[PDB]
Symmetry: C3
Subunit: 402 residues, 3 copies
């Protein structure tokens, strides 16, 4: 329940997700930029050229100056396309935008998985703190009791020293778990991206289930169509195919019309006089009859780049298969390992029942009971470690499946 | 033996390796592109310009219309190079291609190293599974025996509980080793890059020698001459020197030759008529007498980049030296460590022989013999871990030596 | 004291630091390139064009050939700016240079941190070697003593075997510590960057204070004003905020002045004749009245990029906060953990003193005294790991604080 709230807070507030969404907007931006090329590029051109062979003659000087002033609209190099290398670049940018969309979706999924994993780590750390704190209390009781035994003379100073060492070891273990818990809290507050994230998280552990325990892997073909990074690789491959199309179109002759319409006169005063509405059409065909590789090696470059995109697609698919298979193996083995560790914890708890029965029966002293307590609580905390690690493995499996 | 088969399968099928050779074909294509600039670049130009000062007059209107149609060949701004800045870019691309060749060779070497290391890890994991399976069988034997002793009343429930806990601990250990083995298989499958990779590997481990156990490091100068990434950095430094040459050439005047040949007429009907075989010839000397840093800042940028390439080359040399030194230290220490661990395993085996002699002699019960079994089994698997890690260290040493 | 010498050697000699400094020189050069655009770009242009409708007529042929030769200076497209898009690019280059300065400062401080951490690791490894060497000596002494006891028939071969195994385990531990020490030495010599770096480091550990033990974190705002990476992110944000200004200026009309001055003649002989001193001076107003998204998408791309820079700045702030919080938590918990471990080491020391008193008193065996020595040396060496890790945590806290 709180996982959903934390994930919502992250998606609303995490900075890396905002960066990814802005990458989305920028991909749309250059897609629009490239798409603008297909449409006419007409601009208002107001140019005045003063050219003359002798010197001086400024501001209507005494010479044969020709001062042309061309003011009007100009079609700035339209490229009508037989194959649409402009169009090829256009849907190449479109494929880049789609790949960016898939990549941002993958980043969102990864951020959610990190949030859940850090949450689970924090919960496990809280449980381990309860366990280690009460184990240190058990060691303190044992140390005090051995201290009384030595004071009464029934114990050597060596036993007091070893009890002191055991208490120190318990303190060091508690310090290590405290450090782990603080690191987990800081990681969570970073992932949530809000300075009040320490207020949105519960202060105590709970035994409530948080993530679904059984997840069906399905087939590899389904994973191909659902995992975002594979989709991103597919879209990049499509973009590289678009680049191959552009390179192929570059072979063929390119025809461009340069147009203009406006006024022109030999003097500035006649700029807005009748009879100067000039125009210029200039269709031009360029075709390199011998490229020398200038156009060909571009084609081979695009070809090999598309092949590299194919290889990248295959490699990403294989990596995703590797990752999901690892997650499945980890989840299965960890389910069995947690079953074994739960059986072990139950065994130590049975030892608790027996040792307590003996102690209350006056057969075993308090030292044996406390030793049993420490044993069972060590077993319980090494159970919590495995449970947390299994939950993290489940989250990784969910992330891998998309 | 099967290691070479796995390496062949990887080099034939690995997707990242195919990506590397595709990067080499791309780099070669890029060099071809840059080399095409040195050779003449002519193109067939067919242009028709129609211009007139008043408006309308479309399709031979009544005015002083000026229509020009030029159809023919044209040399598009040849740069006659006194310093060969085009040539400088040429062998800069060539050095980039050679550096990419060295980098791809290094990637192939790394792929081989990972394949070998993963395969060794799989072998060690198989041995560890044998070890842990028999350790768990020992634990269950002792558990059943203690269960019988409790049933007969000769043992407390505490002993039965601790035997249960030990069996659970062994089961958890077996689950951990199973997880490790599955992950190793998955990594090997990914490295081989084929869905049938599980058929190219043996289901059982072998004690045969696998990789050469002693490798001579030689001298540092040799490591400079053989290691592929060092060669890549050297070729990149040579490329940066060629860039410095190009920037120096940019200071000097450039001779730009532009020419054309074809037909020109005032009307469309007269394009293919006699007496229109026009031609152009326009050499140009572009030399910026005051660059303002436009050409000088390019220069110290190139010199700074060449110095940075020098620093990178030295840093890569030092990194390779660190890697080979680390690999040598690891190999030596691990040889001695495996000697110690083999001595320890032999010691546990001798203790096994003595405990078995006692048990068959009727002096020690079965529990002591089973305890000796578990002890020797743990020692033997700790030996296998060191042996596997030493093999991995040898492979890392080979990889770092090129 | 030797830390200052080592870090000075690093800054003088480390190849990655020299790489960063050459990166600053490159960034300064790239800014000089961009700043050169604001200033006039004049060009000594010497061009000769020969064009005529019929064929042949080369070298003063018999036709209407026109041979125009222009030799002289030329102002190559001065862009007088109403908003300063060139000025905006200059500001962007300056911001990039400042960001690179902060990044290089960050690389320097990180290099210092790694040098100090490696040096601390080397010192701790030396202490651990002393400890493990004497632990192994104790194991060999116990092994010899048990061997002599067995030879006299007072011990079973089982005790000899277990003593042998213990000695082997101690040897394996010694090999592991030797490997760690060698790796630390190699890392240190790589960080220092000189072949004679191992000459510059002492071969013995020392107990003096090494870095300041208490460091005050201060406020978050102060860290915002001191950490180099956050300053680099701020400068990159400023660069993008100049890019958005450049894109905004791209909307507005831009004026270019193309000028020239020199000689013109219809024949080569008359190039240096009187009255040929010609010139041209040509306003051009370029303004796209209908961009079609060509400029508008550039504008929103700049907006999106600046927003992404804002997100980057915030994310880096949060990352720095996470790092300093982790460092503080680690330092505090590690201070308490080292206190506990020192108490434990003192406890084992007192236990060894008691065991020695008993042994010299003839009550305890030499085996008991040797075991007490081994226990105290194990506690003392596990103290050194905590102390070294605490020192490394302090260095990390210093690094994260800038």
């Amino acid at each position: 329940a709180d996982l959903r709230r934390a994930v919502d807070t992250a998606l609303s507030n995490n900075r890396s997700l905002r960066q990814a969404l802005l990458d989305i907007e920028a991909a749309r931006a250059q897609y629009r930029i490239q798409r603008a090329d297909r449409l006419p590029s007409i601009n208002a051109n107001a140019s005045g050229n003063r050219q003359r062979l002798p010197a001086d003659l400024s501001q209507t000087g005494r010479s044969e100056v020709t001062s042309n002033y061309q003011v009007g609209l100009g079609l700035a190099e339209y490229e009508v396309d037989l194959f649409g290398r402009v169009r090829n670049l256009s849907e190449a940018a479109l494929e880049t935008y789609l790949a960016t969309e898939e990549a941002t979706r993958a980043t969102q999924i990864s951020l959610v998985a990190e949030v859940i994993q850090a949450y689970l780590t924090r919960d496990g750390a809280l449980r381990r703190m309860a366990l280690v704190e009460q184990t240190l209390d058990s060691r303190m009781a044992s140390l005090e009791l051995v201290s009384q035994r030595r004071a009464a003379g029934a114990a050597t100073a060596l036993d007091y020293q070893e009890a002191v060492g055991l208490a120190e070891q318990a303190r060091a273990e508690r310090e290590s778990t405290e450090r782990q818990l603080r690191q987990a809290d800081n990681a969570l507050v970073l992932l949530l991206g809000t300075p009040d994230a320490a207020r949105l998280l519960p202060a105590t552990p709970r035994d409530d289930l948080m993530v679904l325990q059984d997840i069906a892997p399905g087939t590899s073909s389904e994973l191909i169509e659902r995992r975002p990074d594979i989709l991103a690789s597919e879209h990049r491959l499509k973009a590289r195919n678009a680049d191959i199309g552009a390179a192929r179109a570059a072979f063929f002759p390119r025809i461009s019309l340069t147009g203009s319409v406006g006024s022109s006169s030999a003097e500035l005063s006649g700029l807005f006089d009748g009879g100067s509405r000039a125009w210029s059409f200039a269709p031009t065909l360029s075709l390199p009859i011998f490229a020398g590789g200038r156009n060909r090696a571009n084609l081979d470059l695009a070809e090999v780049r598309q092949d590299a995109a194919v290889a990248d697609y295959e490699g990403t698919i294989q990596t995703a298969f590797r990752e999901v298979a690892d997650a499945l193996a980890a989840t299965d083995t960890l389910r069995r390992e947690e079953a074994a560790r739960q059986a072990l914890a139950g065994s130590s708890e049975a030892a608790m029942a027996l040792a307590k029965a003996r102690y209350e029966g006056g057969v075993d002293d308090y030292l044996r009971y406390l030793d049993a307590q420490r044993s069972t609580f060590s077993n319980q905390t090494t159970l919590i470690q495995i449970s947390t690690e299994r939950q993290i493995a489940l989250v990784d499996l969910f992330r891998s499946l998309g």
